[PDB]
């Protein structure tokens, strides 16, 4: 039960620190890692195990380990998080500073050092009993983050081939670097096909856009973003944080969710939320949720085809309006001829623990759904990667290692991941029509 | 507390007996337990209240109502009703009394008793007729409200059922 | 048969008077300015009805179910700042399109055309967050160029995308036309899209208005507030009959059925007595007058909201609401004096109609001189000549076809000949709509299915 964050690159140590402090703030555990609640009252209804290992001195270390070429970011989270995590817990590479963005000099470098990650996993195994797998917090745009999580990946696959891995991963938005970016985006992408078993997708573009216009100032912070991503963090993870009587692990979520290991690629969304009045009853969450206005991904469909969803409520809900709700959305929503209309409604309980967020009373939700708006992300990077190399050869100057002994496996791997994408897109494409079960039908 | 107060003062006026003393302590006695009675059937129990309601759900005084119930029981007076569950029919009335304006009443603690001391009762009237005439409405009353106010009782003349029918012909 | 009604408020005029309308209704059912209301939500008891115009988002806050859409953006924004938080900032629409570049209806036809699915997406949504719906209210303003091209893409999408709903529409005519040409262009393209689609018309002629407005008010000068604030007045008291519903009259579609005789037949003419929730509304208790001297002043040309030009007019359907304590003896009175000076056809038996309202329990009480007021509604065809002084001006104009070179942008249509040929086309159904009222003016209209069977 057991999960172990995995904070890859800046982007993951930013994210990481941004949901340690909102799990701390919301379990009443603060920066300096000590119990905030009274010691006279022991019963408590959230589950802070699986998060954090309680110590002698009631100390709630965060289980965590941070993989980053870039000791900087490292250090500035330590120095903001003094008396939290553990320095043993903290792996910088003994390296220095990063240098290169490609996949290639993250995987050498994961290579080399695995030792250590490989010791220290075994270390924070070894500490408890009770384990189910492991998260994962990178973006596929940066090139040594992206390189560590496939090293991770990797071990993780042939070494624990019983944990289910879950991962975030964060899509550049359209810019420059996604002329290099999009090898190290492709790179991860088959390293999931080959071996993740759950993955969350978030677009940065659709990230921009929904912190500005949810901010008041349009001048959106990669602050802002990681606060963004540890709240959707954390609302996913409400469910196994607090459970009362139906979800008490992401095993349930990702069986109701994820129908097949081919198709382990998910889109979130949340609304409403702050980072002071109430106006969005429960209908109107799942409605905003429903709307692309508010998912964290580029949707790009008039009608995406949704396989599964799943919702999670936050807040004193009605059955009368949940119902409604539900009719509508069976109603608008179109679903596959050979798979299920499934929808999922979980009630999450809110921590008393918690400082009260503004517009208090407003119930808010989130959602996880399976549709055709991922493929279309996937097949604009995998359109980008196949005109940059079809059309200039500059890829073969910036590797190391074996990658930089010689320049045509590179080119042979890289035509493999673009052949394993394609491949994953025509599964999603024929999933999408009804004729995919005709093999049993 | 008025029987003892009154068997002090009888007991007190024992020594007259028949007089004009005690006349006029039955007089005080009789005007205050009818102002008794009529504050209590008007505060604890709403009788103007009630008799307002049934002005306008039997008399059809509310005609937003009537018409609210009217467009939501529609398709039901169209299909024919003789043989139905008739749960239904009730979960139609109480979303046609929440969708009209007496949404007010069923918020109200006392008015949400008021309404749900309607019956949702429907007399069949026809072999395999339309649900508009197979349709029937049923009150049924409660003391102290049934002491007072006449409603459409099995031995009586029916006078609120023909004017129900009437009105509902119209 | 009650359902609820979206305000559409659109152009400048129709922003103005959606704004008074919104205010009138707050000052009635007491919600204010503030959008929270301004009762308890503990009293919960109400003789009236909020739902069918304002959204019940929270337990003490009613949003009006209205959208407003305007190309400028600056009275949208003083609306907003003077009505903070009562409306609601997702239904206001502006597009950032800038100014209107001029006054022809062309203009607002194509603002309406290239945005239209952002109104129609709000509309959706405006609809998908309600349950039992019934028709919209238009406000065209055709004095306005893009107002009324605005109003006339907003009923042609409508017609055809909910063909099961009622639609009635106001039509506000100036007195003086600055720019006469333009302005009867942008009102004879208007009127094309009424008599098309729209089920119900409400002219509103603003001679009649700046009579009212300089008659029972003491300033001399008219100022466009309070001239809309007429008009807002007029609404609210027409949708009275379904905010406090009375016993007879609880539905736009009932009140409707027994003012529209036929679909082609859809203009009426409104008339009121001297208000009494206007700005100078003190002088009011000195004329001292019953329900039967205010059944008088309603069939009086002098309170009509419209010119009159009463030369034996022909009625088809007048109908009336009496708001506050009315006799029924003097009701009767009223319709025996009426009946033997009103003009009726030989065609038809049918007389004049008469409903009782409620007034509302937290309105300033009125003396007993004014506190009955009333409100009259008449299927007259006296508006064949508002639209023919139009038409005249149409067929004295037309003949060298001046401003053509502004209604040519913007609209599907950039050649002359395309225009001029709309414009005829517009004419020609103008003319048969006149013709048609006529001829319904007289008995053979009745005789045409009685000599052919
Ligand atoms: N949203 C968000 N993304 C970040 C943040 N920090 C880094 N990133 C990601 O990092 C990418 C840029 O590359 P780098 O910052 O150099 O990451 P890298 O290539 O792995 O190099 P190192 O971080 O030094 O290991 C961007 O595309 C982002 O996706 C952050 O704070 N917020
Ligand atoms: N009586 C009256 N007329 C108004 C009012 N507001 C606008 N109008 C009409 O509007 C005309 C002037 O043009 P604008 O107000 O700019 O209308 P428009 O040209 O369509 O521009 P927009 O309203 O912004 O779309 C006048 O001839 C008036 O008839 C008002 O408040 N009262």
Same mark, same amino acid.
């Given at each position: ?6 904070? =890859?690159?800046?982007?993951? @140590? ?34 802070? !195990?699986?998060?954090?290992?309680? @110590? ?17 970011? /490292? ?31 993250? $995987?050498? *470098? ?73 090898? +190290? ?14 993955? #969350? ?8 856009? *929904? ?5 008041? +100032?349009?001048? /959106?912070?990669?602050?802002?973003? @990681? ?30 969710? *994820? ?40 949707? =790009? ?7 599964? #969803? ?5 807040? +004193?809900?009605?059955?009368?309006? /949940?119902?409604? =709700? ?7 929503? !179109? ?47 995998? @359109? ?8 200039? =050869? ?26 394993? #994408? ?5 599964? $999603? ?10 093999? #049993?039908? | ?59 059809? &005084? ?68 339309? &649900? ?39």
């Amino acid at each position: 039960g057991e999960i172990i964050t995995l904070q =890859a690159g800046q982007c993951g @140590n930013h994210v990481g620190k941004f949901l340690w402090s909102q799990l701390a703030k919301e379990h009443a555990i603060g920066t300096d890692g000590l119990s905030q609640l009274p010691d006279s009252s022991t019963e408590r209804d959230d589950d802070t !195990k699986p998060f954090f290992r309680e @110590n002698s001195r009631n100390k709630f270390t965060p289980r965590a380990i941070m993989m980053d070429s870039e000791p900087s970011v /490292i250090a500035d989270v330590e120095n903001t998080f003094r008396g939290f995590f553990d320095p043993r817990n903290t792996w910088v590479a003994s390296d220095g500073a990063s240098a290169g963005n490609s996949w290639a000099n993250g $995987y050498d *470098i994961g290579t080399r050092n695995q030792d250590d990650i490989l010791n220290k996993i075994d270390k924070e195994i070894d500490s408890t009993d009770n384990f189910e797998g492991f998260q994962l917090l990178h973006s596929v745009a940066g090139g040594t983050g992206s390189g560590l999580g496939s090293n991770l990946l990797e071990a993780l696959c042939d070494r624990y081939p019983k944990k289910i891995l879950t991962t975030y991963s964060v899509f550049p938005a359209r810019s420059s670097e996604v002329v290099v970016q999009s090898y +190290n985006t492709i790179l991860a992408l088959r390293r999931l096909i080959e071996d993740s078993d759950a993955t #969350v997708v978030f677009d940065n573009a659709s990230l921009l856009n *929904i912190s500005g216009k949810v901010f008041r +100032n349009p001048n /959106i912070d990669l602050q802002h973003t @990681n606060q963004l991503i540890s709240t959707i963090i954390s609302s996913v993870t409400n469910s196994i944080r607090f459970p009362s009587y139906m979800y008490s692990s992401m095993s349930s979520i990702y069986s109701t969710l *994820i129908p097949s290991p081919e198709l382990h690629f998910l889109s979130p969304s949340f609304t409403p939320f702050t980072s002071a009045h109430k106006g969005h009853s429960s209908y109107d969450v799942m409605l905003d949720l429903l709307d692309p206005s508010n998912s964290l991904v580029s949707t =790009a469909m008039n009608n995406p085809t949704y396989f599964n #969803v799943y919702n999670t409520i936050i807040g +004193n809900v009605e059955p009368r309006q /949940i119902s409604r =709700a539900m009719t509508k959305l069976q109603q608008r929503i !179109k679903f596959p001829s050979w798979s299920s209309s499934a929808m999922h409604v979980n009630i999450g309980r809110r921590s008393p623990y918690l400082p009260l967020q503004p517009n208090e009373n407003e119930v808010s939700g989130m959602m996880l759904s399976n549709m055709s708006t991922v493929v279309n992300v996937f097949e604009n990077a995998c @359109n980008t990667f196949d005109k940059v190399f079809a059309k200039g =050869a500059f890829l073969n100057n910036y590797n190391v290692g074996d990658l930089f002994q010689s320049m045509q496996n590179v080119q042979d791997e890289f035509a493999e991941s673009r052949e394993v #994408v394609q491949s994953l897109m025509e599964d $999603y494409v024929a999933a999408e029509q009804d004729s995919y079960l005709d093999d #049993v039908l | 507390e008025f029987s003892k107060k009154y068997h002090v003062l009888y007991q007190s006026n024992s020594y007259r007996g028949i007089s004009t003393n005690f006349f006029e302590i039955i007089n005080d006695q009789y005007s205050e337990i009818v102002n008794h009675t009529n504050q209590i059937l008007n505060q604890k129990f709403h009788y103007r209240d009630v008799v307002f309601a049934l002005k306008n759900i039997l008399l059809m &005084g509310k005609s937003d109502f009537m018409d609210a119930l009217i467009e939501k029981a529609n398709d039901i007076l169209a299909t024919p009703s003789d043989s139905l569950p008739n749960y239904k029919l009730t979960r139609v009335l109480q979303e046609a009394v929440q969708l009209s304006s007496l949404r007010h009443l069923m918020n109200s603690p006392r008015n949400s008793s008021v309404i749900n001391g309607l019956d949702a009762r429907v007399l069949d009237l026809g072999h395999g007729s339309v &649900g508009w005439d197979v349709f029937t409405l049923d009150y049924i009353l409660y003391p102290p409200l049934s002491l007072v106010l006449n409603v459409n009782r099995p031995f009586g003349r029916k006078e609120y059922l023909r004017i129900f029918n009437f009105l509902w012909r119209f």
